Amino acid sequence: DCQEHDIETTHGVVHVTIRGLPKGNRPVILTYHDIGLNHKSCFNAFFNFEDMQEITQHFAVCHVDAPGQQEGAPSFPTGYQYPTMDELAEMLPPVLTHLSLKSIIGIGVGAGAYILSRFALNHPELVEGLVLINVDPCAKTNVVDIILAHHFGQEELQANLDLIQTYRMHIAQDINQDNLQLFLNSYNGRRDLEIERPILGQNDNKSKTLKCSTLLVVGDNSPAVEAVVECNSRLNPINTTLLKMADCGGLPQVVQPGKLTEAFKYFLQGMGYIPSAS
Amino acid sequence: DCQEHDIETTHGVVHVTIRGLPKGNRPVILTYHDIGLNHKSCFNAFFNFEDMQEITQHFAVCHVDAPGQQEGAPSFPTGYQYPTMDELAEMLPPVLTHLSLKSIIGIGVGAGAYILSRFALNHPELVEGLVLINVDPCAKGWMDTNVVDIILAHHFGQEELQANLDLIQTYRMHIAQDINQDNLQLFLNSYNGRRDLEIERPILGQNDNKSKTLKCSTLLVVGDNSPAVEAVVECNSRLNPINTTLLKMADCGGLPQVVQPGKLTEAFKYFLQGMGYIPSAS
């Protein structure tokens, strides 16, 4: 059923986790986490949710842990040349090639969102759709207090509820505090996606945009509300949908997995997959 | 769902592969494999069987890979002190500890079987039951070309082996390619040098000079055409018939988990049923 691979790229190694088994005329669900998380902390709560298993049975689910961000990853040396956000997306075709994966339905959060997008623009042939959670297509004391600051809204983060401290502990303990610095640094070094909404008559600016179907997701109480909204205005509305989730801030995948599973289903039905929908 | 771990022991690292998540009370099914195999080669065919998924979903399955037997394991150095079978069995307690596992239900093949049994004698509090496939409790007595040819003989009966069926060739290629040929020899060496299990059937009249025997429920499994049959039968004779059962699988030889898995799943169900697990049959 499952298998974990350590795949050799030209930008070093990337640790993946295949769950389920795919068919040759059916795609794979590739996942990519945000800064401070891994495939387990980021997605597994959402992915092991009851409503998802009905979906996931039909499509094999592959979870990509970023370089040094996989659990039990050794510390990267001090002067290691950590792959840049753009380079990370350069490492994604090999992952598909290694596992003879013809195409994916991407699911990414924040940095994972950006990296899946870059990849989708670089290789739109290999990407069929994108769920882009809390995506920011523009550029930007304690590293842990910085990532929780990116993840959750001040009210929510200040309130330090069970979620806040739970994931505060994950970041702290689960993820390499050396490799996490280099992955944060990388994300922080990200350039503008430089995607503009197309015009039917004629384009005022010759800017490429996502050809594949896109579901943008952001909590009302998310700090990424403006950034996901910018992105939407810069994306082809014929292929894009914007979901603003109520009573939700950081990690809407875990905060509201019920609401998000329903949308992913509606989204997937739209492409032609899970037509029966139980 | 699944997770791999490279677990530090005092006898070095041991590779393991956890699928599902277990609670405190219910025990986590533990596998240990034979020489020239790994958890993948040995168990995943059997474990991924239809009828098993019904049982295995309900229990967690920690697949242990032997030192330097896990896929993509680097060659050990020339003079590397490779853990003895007893030392291999001492690596198990730290694994339960590392994964906050309370107890296990062991499944072992060949070396796998012996290692779990040494563990079960060391720590009866940790084992609730054992299924032992093609186990040999007695010392080899063959101290001395190609480990692969050696290993094939070990796993498959001469009559079976003479035919050269798809399984003999399939597993002949697996032993060659799957395993680092440096580390295999050492694991083969380590298994061959094994000592007598020192089990003796008790007598009900009076204590049999404080005889030492397994205290957990046991199911010994062997194919009719297996070369291990009289070793397993000896083992059985040396064990408590009250807490033991011997399963002779008809029209079957080496690797019964791979061959006739439906039958073994059914047997393995009844085994689990005896413990008080799986109240209703699937």
Author numbering:
A (entry chain A): 29 to 168, 183 to 320
B (entry chain B): 29 to 172, 183 to 320
What's written in the study?
To determine the effect of the residues in forming helix, we constructed a helical wheel model using the helix α6 sequence. The helix α6 model of NDRG3 is amphipathic where the electrostatic surface appears to be analogous to that of NDRG2. Based on the helical wheel model, we designed NDRG3 I171M/S176H and C30S/I171M/S176H mutants, which mimicked the helix α6 sequences of NDRG2, and determined the crystal structure of the I171M/S176H mutant at 3.3 Å resolution. Taken all together, the unfolded helix α6 region of NDRG3 is structurally unique in comparison to NDRG2 or any other α/β-hydrolase fold proteins, and the structure is not only determined by nearby sequences but seems to be influenced by its surrounding environment.
Compared with NDRG2, the helix α6 region of NDRG3 is a flexible loop.
